[PDB]
Design a protein around this ligand. Structure first.
Ligand code: CA
Ligand code: CA
Lengths: 82, 80
């Protein structure tokens, strides 16, 4: 089954798990303010790691479009680039 | 039954079915260049409509995180 994705406004990339779950974004919060997608404090939990939106967006998009993760070698080069 | 999402480098968002299908991005093409997400010609097909990456990003994110589409009033106010 496909990986879970979790959103939190915890910041800190510029991260403990207590920090992450204290600021988790609900559906209702996102549905009332989609502009949070540009919030630099937005953190994405996927693959047991923490990413900002600019690093997680391809992985999110690949899962929604092809229902398949980006290859592990692909994720490494996308991240070591940035 | 969540909405289908299709990618295409068809551009021209400033669209024919023919031009969209001709430049549909496969998994291998995206896996070889994730930078396509910032390509100005990237077109997203969802809800029988065409969006660039900027408008389509929250819709796809809410489908991935909450497995539920954004509210129609929200998508409409977000796309305004
Ligand atoms: Ca919250
Ligand atoms: Ca193609």
């Amino acid at each position: 089954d496909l990986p879970d994705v979790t959103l939190s406004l915890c910041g800190g990339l510029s991260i403990s798990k207590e920090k992450f779950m204290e600021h988790i974004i609900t559906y209702h919060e996102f549905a009332e303010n989609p502009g949070l997608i540009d919030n630099p404090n937005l953190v994405i939990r996927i693959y047991n790691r923490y990413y900002n939106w600019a690093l997680a967006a391809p992985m999110i998009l690949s899962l929604q479009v092809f229902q398949k993760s980006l290859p592990k070698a692909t994720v490494e080069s996308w991240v070591k680039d940035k």
